[PDB]
Specification:
Chain B: Belongs to the ATPase alpha/beta chains family. Chain B: It is a peripheral membrane protein. This is part of a larger assembly, with two copies of chain A, two copies of chain B, one copy of chain D (about 170 residues), one copy of chain E (about 260 residues) and two copies of chain F. With about 45 residues, chain A is mainly alpha-helical. Chain A has one helix and no strands. The radius of gyration of chain A is 18 Å and the shape is rod-shaped. In chain B, strands 9, 11, 14, 15, 16, 17, 18, 19, 20 and 21 form a ten-stranded mixed beta sheet that branches. In chain B, strands 1-7-4-5-6-3-2 form a seven-stranded antiparallel beta sheet, with no helix packed on it. Chain F is an alpha+beta fold. In chain F, helix 11 packs across helix 12, helix 12 packs antiparallel against helix 13 and helix 14 runs antiparallel to helix 15. The chains are: A mainly alpha (about 45), B alpha/beta (about 450), D alpha+beta (about 170), E mainly alpha (about 260), F alpha+beta (about 600). Chains B and H meet through helix 3, helix 5, helix 8 and helix 10 of B and helix 1 and helix 4 of H.
Chain lengths: ~45, ~450, ~25, ~170, ~260, ~600, ~250, ~200
């Protein structure tokens, strides 16, 4: 539920830091996708 | 004056335990006293007293205790702690971790002896760092410029080319030239191939008359790896604060030094602190790193660039963490850039010289430089943001402004960061390359630069 | 840290006892 | 165009290949001269020990000094065979000064059965009664010990003080 | 809040002995009868030559007064009266005013919050600045203004909202704050002060006659450089026969300068 | 009398013949007189934590016991001094040695002997007078701005047996002698105090007056009280110098102390170079702030004990100045670097790690340190109040407040002036993030504001609400654009921008904003909020009308008032009289009221 | 009232005995003198830090975050001196207060206190930042004794049923709020928006109270019902039909 | 322990060894062989070996650099395609993924139990890489050389015209160092170079 339950280790710290960078990157990519579509959508509304 | 009293020698080895030999019946031992062990076969070995208690003196032998015994072993005591014999003639020369020369030249004729442990520089007497050192690497000098007297570590990771960057700084480094400068380059835990690389590249590519080179090899005994940084800094203090020289101290792998503090702390039976390093590791790295700065009434000046292998690439690790607390910057070497075959692969985004605005400006370098570095950072950052946008939206969805930032990004990695191992760019050549890129933009897009600076430097 | 601290204290006790046993 | 800059560094490289060796030959010369000053000093000490008057004053010092380090109930002095009469006198003059400074009695012997090698340039070795602790007080040992520590004064007087030493700190 | 019992009783003795020194200081003659009576309970233990040990034992025994809150308030009331009297030393105020101001302080909620203490702090800053002040226009003006303020305070006390006293504080503190190079602004402040004081001669007999002459001289010395005509400089020089500082002297200098401002 | 070294292991020296020692008693070790504290007794043996490098200490070396635990000399000669954390005078260890280093084994006295000062005995005293701890038996005129009040040490009491007449004296002179229980105590202008022990007080008081910094955002929205406890997130990217310099060079605090906990060597020399060049106006003179401060500077390489003591020396100096009846203010540059010195000394003591590595006691050391602040009734008889204000900077990794020192500090301090790198990158100086920042002293200043500025609590409340509403409205602006907002929302956003850019922001290099008085601050905000309420009145009053007022109509018909509101920052307390500034602000109130009447 | 004060600059080891002195006085007043005693223990965290210090100083076996192994027992030796005893009209009530470190509910101080106490009352930044005084978040809270302290003879018959249904609706309100924060109000049904409205109306009325305002249980229950009436009678799935017939329509 | 290179033996080893061959569980899980991760592995010796390569294999150093670049650009493009899908990529990027698939599956993959693949001489190795990167430069050139043209070359147009070449390129691993002489393998790979160039002329 609240946590991923990878077992506490330097392995898990490595993997979770990489997951955080992956998730923040994925947020920003999908936010860029949203903004690009949002700009086109607002242009379409005016048109 | 001097120790006019003759050296004792003992056969009283009451025990041997790992790297330690425990003399007993000792007369008034000093803590940290140097001793010369002699094995049963007559082989000399150095050691230092690591503990004393009443009649006992626990020597850590420098080499391993292989061949010691409780009987035929004998142990001369010097009566004194480790003093380096120091001089200006330690320039142009290559030394092992103990400070014995290995360049086939003679032993050093000391201009003075110094206590290797040094002393704290008085905080009233330390003076603010206020003019740039040219390292010649554009990703340093145009983005992260170093004030003489700054401490600024190059963080790196296992396998990255930080030793080639360290060598390239050691060859290229010098004053700006709008003579009296000398590197002290100290290397620890160096595999013998990398030791040949430094010794050979420095001897070959013109540097030696302005550098002192200390090598501690990976298989040199671990206490010599603790000694080497202090040994090098003791020479830098002599060159700077007694001989008025400007100095850049380069320390090649502070992580291999942290890997030595582990062993010596275990040799004292101290309980391991945070992540198995000694608790006092913050103070010990401070007593290395703060042997630096300008000082009141001397022209001399010690900069430092500690090269530091982040274990597992982790900035939260104690070795980079403590170093980030003690030193006024960081320079990050990046695996992303190294895999792209960009050399030197310095990543200019997470890097920061906290003293940059006092290193550079009019008179010290060129008037524009402080403006150009802010603008290059902004364009590289927006360029990376646009390159991520292109990967999402496809090229035809980019604006004309985005296509400029993307073209700047491409040219900046392939001309500003990229430099090769022997291209000694002056600050002026770095700034001209900065303008050769920034001139890609329309004049009005360069919003961090003042209109006066643009009018004086944007024209070709 | 705690296990190593106790080991180190046990060693200190054993050293002290071993020196007392010289008498 | 890059190569046309780099030839100035090739000039500096050829200059360094020459210069860096040439100055090592000057340093080698410096250390040879110091080494020969130590050789002349060892020769002069080997002359000084032939005067029984000054040599007695030396042994009176060297013996007493050894004893003052190795404070113990029983001591052994080892010396060259031919020097033994001078050393015996030195021990007999030192024992009173040992009692005076240390405030404790001592038994001191000279080990006539175990003389030192004849080619040593005079002076003595001192061992405690267990033969487990020693001190070496040969004139050669003092010459090495003192010449090593006085080496900055040797350099500064012998080849002149370096004008770059603006601060002594 | 508290202390070790040894500390607490040692502070009580300190208050008692101090109140006695202050009572002797504000009144070496027993003239302040109602004040002296209102401290007789503490004063007796210090007017009697008791040993420190004897009074400390009497404090532990509860024979001496020993509430530090009450003793501190009572001590503060006496000292803030002493501070007034001391701060006006060249203008020793009436006994009836002292015991009246004391009654107002005895009635007050909190002397540290009181504007009474604020007025005295402002008086102290002004007074204390003079103690090492060299001869200088600002310093000479402040010495004079301070003496007038001390006189008015000795006439009306601190608790009286006499508009003169309140303006004298504002003006004196502002001139003390005014930057030392600002000679024309310091001059204008002094001119404005002498115009705003209702008296034709606000400083007459208030301070040494030498300082009165120095004030007259000071007005002349910084007026004269403005005069482009030698005839007006001579008419201004003729005013230096004066020694008392008067509004008419300032108005005469001002008229000679105003004639030069027309004669350009 | 003195003991002898028995053993050494790293910085820990065991000694013997220490029978009369005490735990935490200060000791000199070795022929070079190295400093250290006893950390264990074992009978006649004792274990000393040595501070400086023990290299070259020998078995059988002398071990002189100092008659005191770790302690601060207090007296004349503090002002303008630079000390390290164990109270050694770095300016004199420079000038007396002629060396750039602190030599291992310093023995220089902390308040320099043979330097005479002008001492005035308190003329109210006589032989046979009763005296107690905190009594001001005289004054030393050591500098024009700060009359140094001498006082009887807090543990001392008795009857005066002799007092020196007026004259010139130094630390070697017996200025005072007193007797108690038949025993005379001799005394000097120099006093000594245990650094880890609070200096006691008659009563610690509730804090109720503003520590006016001359900085609008601070003094208005997050007022720190005199005697208050506060934190600053000290990091390079956010400009921590702006607050600390402004506090020193203007704020209403009689004496400043500044503690270098353990700063980076260059950044410490930046402070020690720069502070002497700062000047503040007093009595219409301009003078160096070195007349009103002392600097306790430790670089990262100073001994572990000198870093962990740094703040305790600082507070002890600050409490001594508090007991002279001064409103002292003390900076700490990085309580985080002091907390590292705690981690290290606990590491060397082999004590168990608590939170993240720090000792169990980190929270208690922080809390028992911050409690040394506050306003107080002093000890002794002249009844004076004083205070110590503590400004403890913190340096959370990546800004993460879960960091033990930062978390415990935010637990204990009543004010947090959250500086932010984002605001600094936008050059929004003083760059204090008003959303993150807070003060718990608002209630405690109600009494002050009700007397002096009775409208100001309404104004502050409205200001924070207006700024908070703009932060919520900005989400709607991102979702649907500025055009979609209601007229009340649009005028709120415009005014919140005006408050943000022309009231919160302040250019401290300009003559008009180098300092900003409290009356100026109130008058500026009063005008912006009076404009807000009348603008909002015209908008809301013309709800459901045929012609409705909007911010664009206000800008068209009375944008001169918006321009004037932005201009109100330029008013100068030097060139303009206080009454002239108040009159111009009152004129803008009349101007805007007549302008609003032209619409509604 | 009797105040035992130990301040942050008083000795840390005295904190070990400070709450024990308070409880000893509370035992004397309650069990010896029949007083209806309430014991307030303030910042048990600043007490627990003294346990952690003593533990580290003694080298005791460390539990979670370095508290001594006996931490649960030490807390019990404080917290069990409470409740009525036969023949004595006294009744020690304890309301300890503790600042949770880094706001973490699972920290050893709250967590071990959790195992010992008769349920716990939680105060929350998510309420306090919104100015909702007192910032008591009902949901994570429980009282172990409420089960028998309520219903006929103690409180109105409905009370136990109302309490459970208020938890149900408040909890579902937090769940639909968490849904809205990802997928928007367009994904929510009309019933899900009623649970979101319930959470809003509940915090603004039921929890929000004046610092000097006293509300009876009966007034609190009537506020509860006027909020529960937001849903149709049949939606109140925790409440029996008899309780709904007596208390829903009013 | 647990495959984690943070381990003290790994960390100490990586501080000393000049070469590291980081075998990755992800490649093992996909049964890629020999499972060497080409992003986390390293070899410091390239600095010396460039002189040997410049004497004996003059084309190799350029090819090695271009290989690393393609392999790193594959990771960037992969992490974006994993969320945005292929549609945003430029034709250069589609080609970069195509040749990266050839490199990772047909150059860098190698089977330890196949007679022709059990070992690979360097003559074969440089030839295979030279052709795959020559294909990359030419396929990328075909796209870039038709920017703004009346017709633009695309990955699909290339896949249609060059399908035989892609089969031949993936087939280069099958040449047998035992039964084929190195000059024969080199001559066959030279025929693939001519085949590529002639096939690219049908696009351009």
């Amino acid at each position: 539920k609240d946590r991923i339950e990878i077992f506490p280790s330097r392995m898990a710290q490595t993997i979770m830091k990489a997951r955080l960078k992956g998730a923040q990157t994925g947020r920003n990519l999908l936010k860029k996708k949203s903004d690009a579509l949002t700009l086109r959508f607002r242009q379409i509304l005016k048109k | 004056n001097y120790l006019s009293q003759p050296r004792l020698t003992y056969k009283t080895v009451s025990g041997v335990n790992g790297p330690l030999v425990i003399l007993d019946h000792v007369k008034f031992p000093r803590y940290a006293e140097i001793v010369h062990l002699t094995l049963p076969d007559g082989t000399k070995r150095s050691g230092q007293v690591l503990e004393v208690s009443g009649s006992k003196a626990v020597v850590q032998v420098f080499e391993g205790t292989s061949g010691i015994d409780a009987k035929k072993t004998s142990c001369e005591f010097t009566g004194d702690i480790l003093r380096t014999p120091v001089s200006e003639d330690m320039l142009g020369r290559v030394f092992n971790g103990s400070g014995k020369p290995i360049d086939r030249g003679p032993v050093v004729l000391a201009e003075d002896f110094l206590d290797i442990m040094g002393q704290p520089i008085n905080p009233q007497c330390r003076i603010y760092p206020e003019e740039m050192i040219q390292t010649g690497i554009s990703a340093i000098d145009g983005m992260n410029s170093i004030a003489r007297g700054q401490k600024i570590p190059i963080f790196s990771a296992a396998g990255l080319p930080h030793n080639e960057i360290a060598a390239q700084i050691c060859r290229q480094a010098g004053l700006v030239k709008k003579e009296n400068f000398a590197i002290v380059f100290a290397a620890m835990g160096v595999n013998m191939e990398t030791a040949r690389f430094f010794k050979s590249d420095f001897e070959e590519n013109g540097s030696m008359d302005n550098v002192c080179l200390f090598l501690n090899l990976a298989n040199d005994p671990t206490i010599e790896r603790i000694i080497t940084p202090r040994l090098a800094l003791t020479t830098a203090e002599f060159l700077a604060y007694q001989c008025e020289k400007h100095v850049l101290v380069i320390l090649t792998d502070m992580s291999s030094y942290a890997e030595a503090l582990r062993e010596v702390s275990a040799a004292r039976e101290e309980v391991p602190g945070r992540r198995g390093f000694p608790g006092y590791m913050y103070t010990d790295l401070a007593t290395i790193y703060e042997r630096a700065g300008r000082v009141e009434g001397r022209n001399g000046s010690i900069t430092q660039i500690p090269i530091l292998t982040m274990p597992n690439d982790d900035i939260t690790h104690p070795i980079p963490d403590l170093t980030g607390y003690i030193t006024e910057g960081q320079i990050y070497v990046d695996r992303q850039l190294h895999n792209r075959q960009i050399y030197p692969p310095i990543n200019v985004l997470p890097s920061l010289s906290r003293l940059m605005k006092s290193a550079i400006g009019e008179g010290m370098t060129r008037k524009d430089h402080a403006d150009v570095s802010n603008q290059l950072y902004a364009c590289y950052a927006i360029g990376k943001d646009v390159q991520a946008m292109k990967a999402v939206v496809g090229e035809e969805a980019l604006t004309s402004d985005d296509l400029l930032y993307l073209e700047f990004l491409q040219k900046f990695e392939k001309n500003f960061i990229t430099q090769g191992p022997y291209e000694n760019r002056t600050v002026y050549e770095t700034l001209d390359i900065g303008w050769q890129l920034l001139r890609i933009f329309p004049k009005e897009m360069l919003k961090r630069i003042p209109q006066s600076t643009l009018s004086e430097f944007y024209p070709r | 840290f705690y296990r190593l601290k106790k080991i180190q204290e046990k060693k200190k006790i054993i050293k002290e006892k071993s020196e007392k046993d010289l008498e | 165009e890059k190569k046309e800059k780099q030839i100035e560094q090739q000039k500096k490289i050829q200059m360094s290949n020459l210069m860096n060796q040439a100055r090592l030959k000057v340093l080698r010369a410096r250390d040879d001269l110091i080494t020969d000053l130590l050789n002349e000093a060892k020769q002069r000490l080997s002359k000084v020990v032939k005067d029984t008057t000054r040599y007695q004053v030396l042994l009176d010092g060297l013996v007493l000094q050894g004893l003052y380090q190795l404070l113990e109930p029983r001591m052994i002095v080892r010396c060259r065979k031919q020097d033994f009469p001078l050393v015996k006198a030195a021990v007999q003059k030192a024992i009173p000064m040992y009692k005076i400074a240390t405030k404790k009695d001592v038994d001191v012997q000279i080990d006539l059965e175990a003389y030192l090698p004849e080619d040593i340039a005079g002076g003595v070795e001192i061992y405690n009664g267990d033969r487990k602790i020693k001190v070496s007080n040969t004139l050669e040992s003092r010459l090495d010990l003192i010449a090593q520590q006085m080496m900055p004064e040797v350099r500064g007087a012998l080849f002149g003080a370096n004008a770059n030493r603006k601060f002594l700190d | 809040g508290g202390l070790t019992s040894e500390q607490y009783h040692s502070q009580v003795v300190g208050k008692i002995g101090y109140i006695a020194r202050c009572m002797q200081t504000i009144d070496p003659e027993n003239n302040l009868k109602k004040i002296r009576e209102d401290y007789q309970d503490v004063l007796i233990w210090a007017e009697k030559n008791y040993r420190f040990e004897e009074i400390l034992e009497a404090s532990k025994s509860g024979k001496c007064p020993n509430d530090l809150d009450a003793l501190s308030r009572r001590s503060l009331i006496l000292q803030e009266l002493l501070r007034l009297v001391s701060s006006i030393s060249p203008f020793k105020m009436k006994l009836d005013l002292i015991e009246s101001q004391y009654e107002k302080m005895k009635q007050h909620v909190n002397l540290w919050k009181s504007d009474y203490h604020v007025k005295l702090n402002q008086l102290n800053q002004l007074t204390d600045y003079l103690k090492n002040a060299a001869p200088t226009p600002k310093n000479n003006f402040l010495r004079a203004m301070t003496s007038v303020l001390q006189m008015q305070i000795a006439q009306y006390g601190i608790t009286e909202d006499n508009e003169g006293i309140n303006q004298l504080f504002k003006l004196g503190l502002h001139l003390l704050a005014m930057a030392n190079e600002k000679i024309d602004e310091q001059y204008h402040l002094f001119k404005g002060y002498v115009k705003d004081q209702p008296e034709e001669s606000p400083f007459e007999g208030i301070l040494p006659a030498e300082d009165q002459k120095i004030l007259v001289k000071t007005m002349i010395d910084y007026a004269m450089p403005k005069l482009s005509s030698k005839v007006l400089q001579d008419k201004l020089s003729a005013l230096s026969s004066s020694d008392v500082l008067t509004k008419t002297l300032l108005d005469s200098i001002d008229r000679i300068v105003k004639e030069n401002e027309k004669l350009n | 009398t003195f003991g002898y070294v028995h053993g050494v292991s790293g910085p820990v020296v065991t000694a013997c013949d220490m029978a009369g020692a005490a735990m935490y008693e200060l000791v000199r070790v070795g022929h070079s007189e190295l400093v250290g504290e006893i950390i264990r007794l074992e009978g006649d043996m004792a274990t000393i934590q040595v501070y400086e490098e023990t290299s070259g200490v020998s078995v059988g070396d002398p071990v002189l016991r100092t008659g005191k635990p770790l302690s601060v000399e207090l007296g004349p000669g503090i002002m303008g001094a630079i000390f390290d954390g164990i109270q050694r005078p770095l300016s004199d260890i420079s000038s007396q040695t002629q060396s750039i280093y602190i030599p291992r084994g310093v023995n220089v006295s902390a308040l320099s002997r043979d330097i005479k000062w002008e001492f005035i005995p308190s003329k109210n005293l006589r032989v046979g007078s009763h005296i107690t701890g905190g009594d001001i038996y005289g004054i030393v005129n050591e500098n024009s701005l700060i009359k140094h009040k001498i006082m009887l040490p807090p543990r001392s009491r008795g009857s005066v047996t002799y007092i020196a007449p007026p004259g010139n004296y130094d630390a070697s002179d017996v200025v005072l002698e007193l007797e108690f229980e038949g025993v005379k105590e001799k005394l000097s202008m120099v006093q000594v105090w245990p650094v880890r022990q609070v200096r006691p007080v008659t009563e610690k008081l509730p804090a109720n007056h503003p520590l006016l910094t001359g900085q609008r955002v601070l003094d208005a929205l997050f007022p720190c009280v005199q005697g208050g406890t506060t934190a600053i997130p000290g990091a390079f990217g956010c400009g921590k110098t702006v607050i600390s310099q402004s506090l020193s060079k203007y704020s209403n605090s009689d004496v400043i102390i500044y503690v270098g906990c353990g700063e980076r060597g260059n950044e410490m020399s930046e402070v020690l170079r720069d502070f002497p060049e700062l000047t503040m106006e007093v009595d219409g003179k301009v003078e160096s702030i070195m007349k009103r401060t002392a600097l306790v500077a430790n670089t990262s390489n100073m001994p572990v004990a000198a870093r962990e003591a740094s703040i305790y020396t600082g507070i002890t100096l600050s409490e001594y100045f508090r007991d002279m009846g001064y409103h002292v203010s003390m900076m700490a540059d990085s309580t985080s670097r002091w907390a590292e010195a705690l981690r290290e000394i606990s590491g060397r003591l082999a004590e168990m790690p608590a939170d993240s590595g720090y000792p169990a006691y980190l929270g208690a050391r922080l809390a028992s340190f911050y409690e040394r602040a506050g306003r107080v009734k002093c000890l002794g008889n002249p009844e004076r109040e004083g205070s110590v204000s503590i400004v403890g900077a913190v340096s959370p990794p990546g800004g993460d407040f879960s960091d033990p020192v930062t978390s415990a500090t935010l637990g204990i301090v009543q004010v947090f002036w959250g500086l932010d790198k984002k605001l600094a990158q936008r050059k929004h100086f003083p760059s204090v993030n008003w959303l993150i920042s807070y003060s718990k002293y608002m209630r405690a200043l109600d009494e002050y504001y009700d007397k002096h500025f009775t409208e100001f609590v309404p104004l502050r409340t409205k200001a924070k609400e207006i700024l908070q509403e703009e932060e919520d409205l900005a989400e709607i602006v991102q979702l649907v654009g500025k055009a979609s907002l209601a007229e009340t929302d649009k005028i709120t956003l415009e005014v919140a921008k005006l408050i943000k850019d022309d009231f919160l922001q302040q250019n401290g290099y300009t003559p008009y904003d180098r300092f900003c008085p409290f009356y100026k601050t109130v008058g500026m905000l009063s005008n912006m909020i009076s404009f807000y309420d009348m603008a909002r009145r015209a908008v809301e009053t013309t709800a459901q009308s045929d012609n409705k007022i909007t911010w664009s109509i206000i800008r068209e018909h009375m944008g001169e008032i918006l321009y004037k509101l932005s201009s109100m920052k330029f008013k100068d307390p030097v060139k303009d009289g206080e009454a002239k500034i108040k009159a111009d602000y009152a004129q803008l109130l009349e101007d805007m009221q007549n302008a609003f009447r032209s619409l509604e």
